[PDB]
Amino acid sequence: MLSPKAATLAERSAGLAFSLYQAMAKDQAVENILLSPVVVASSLGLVSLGGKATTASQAKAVLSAEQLRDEEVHAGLGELLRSLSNSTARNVTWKLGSRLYGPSSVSFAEDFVRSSKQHYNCEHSKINFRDKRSALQSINEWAAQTTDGKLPEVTKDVERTDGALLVNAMFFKPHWDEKFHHKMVDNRGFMVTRSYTVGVTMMHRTGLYNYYDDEKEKLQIVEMPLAHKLSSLIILMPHHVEPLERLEKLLTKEQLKIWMGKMQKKAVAISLPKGVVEVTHDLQKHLAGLGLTEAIDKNKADLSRMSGKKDLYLASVFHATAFEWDTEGNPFDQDIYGREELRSPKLFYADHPFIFLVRDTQSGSLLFIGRLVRPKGDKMRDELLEH
Numbered sequence: 001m002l003s004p005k006a007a008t009l010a011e012r013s014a015g016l017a018f019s020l021y022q023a024m025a026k027d028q029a030v031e032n033i034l035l036s037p038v039v040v041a042s043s044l045g046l047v048s049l050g051g052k053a054t055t056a057s058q059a060k061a062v063l064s065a066e067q068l069r070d071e072e073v074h075a076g077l078g079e080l081l082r083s084l085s086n087s088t089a090r091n092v093t094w095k096l097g098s099r100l101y102g103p104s105s106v107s108f109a110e111d112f113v114r115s116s117k118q119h120y121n122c123e124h125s126k127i128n129f130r131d132k133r134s135a136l137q138s139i140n141e142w143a144a145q146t147t148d149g150k151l152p153e154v155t156k157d158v159e160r161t162d163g164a165l166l167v168n169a170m171f172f173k174p175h176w177d178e179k180f181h182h183k184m185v186d187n188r189g190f191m192v193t194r195s196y197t198v199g200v201t202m203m204h205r206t207g208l209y210n211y212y213d214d215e216k217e218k219l220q221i222v223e224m225p226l227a228h229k230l231s232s233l234i235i236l237m238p239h240h241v242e243p244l245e246r247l248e249k250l251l252t253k254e255q256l257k258i259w260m261g262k263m264q265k266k267a268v269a270i271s272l273p274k275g276v277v278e279v280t281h282d283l284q285k286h287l288a289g290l291g292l293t294e295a296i297d298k299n300k301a302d303l304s305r306m307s308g309k310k311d312l313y314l315a316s317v318f319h320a321t322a323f324e325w326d327t328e329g330n331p332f333d334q335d336i337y338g339r340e341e342l343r344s345p346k347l348f349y350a351d352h353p354f355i356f357l358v359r360d361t362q363s364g365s366l367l368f369i370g371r372l373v374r375p376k377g378d379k380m381r382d383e384l385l386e387h
Helices: 004-026 037-050 054-062 070-082 110-119 132-146 245-250 253-262 284-289
Strands: 033-035 094-102 122-126 164-172 185-191 197-214 219-225 231-238 264-279 314-325 346-349 354-360 366-372
Touching: 004 033, 004 037, 004 070, 004 245, 004 253, 004 284, 004 366, 033 264, 033 314, 037 054, 037 070, 037 094, 037 110, 037 164, 037 314, 037 366, 054 070, 070 110, 094 132, 110 122, 132 164, 185 264, 197 253, 197 346, 219 264, 219 346, 231 245, 231 253, 264 366, 284 314
Parallel strands: 094 122, 164 314, 264 346
Antiparallel strands: 033 366, 094 164, 185 197, 197 219, 197 264, 219 231, 231 354, 264 314, 354 366
């Protein structure tokens, strides 16, 4: 559970994440989305830490933290970052690294290096893009080591090679409160579009889950608690195989509350795609839209508290995440509700794009927002030699 200052920041980060999600969903190039509100927030907090004047004020403004003091903002976000581990088993089902890359010519201020590592646990490194292959190799190897291989490649190309490159590498694996059986796994087809279908491995389970079927808006919503009901995962999926654009319009902080209230603990037969979903986002373009125009502009940016000198702007903000869907979770006692309690269950068969949200139960803060559109897999051909 959170302090009042951190709780208010948590709510604003949740706003930024939905605002970014909607902004990214509109981009037709974006397929999967995976945002971690508190890690997005800490990127803005890092700008207010190593910035001066309108560059740092815009960072506090995007955080709606103009009333809070500078040290208060850095401690509140710092409390938020430590609270992510609180309902996630640190270093085994949740790994996170944050590193700032500056050109070889630049040297970071020891005052900034101390306070960024203190609150944001930020790492600092220099990188020269003359050898572009060795610059990408240094970033990708760092993110791979941070996630112990789950996120092998953050990016295949760096566009802006003359500023600060903030990189956030993550690995999160939701640990179910009632585990799926390790053998209730088979191969199915996931329909990306009505025409394109990829071969995926799926995990299946039937249990009691809070569920709502919106027959009017043609969608299903299920909540799947995680280990010790300390956090819970919600999934919103349309009835037909359709683009999530329609469903995304309905996705609001208020509509979610409505849907949540309409749920009831029914027997549901859930089938989810099993595997790792690797997603990298360069939030630079989208952060400018939310009100961070100075830091991202080479000429307006003042990042003197960071390098003791100007000629340094926020070139990129990579938000790379490896989200693993696996069967593992806490065990459940057999003859808890009896096999006659799951007699005729509702069908939540996730074989087409869906939206999902992880939420902290002790603090109420949003842990993740995202959507699975194209899971990892090769297009399976139109066989249809029925079973």
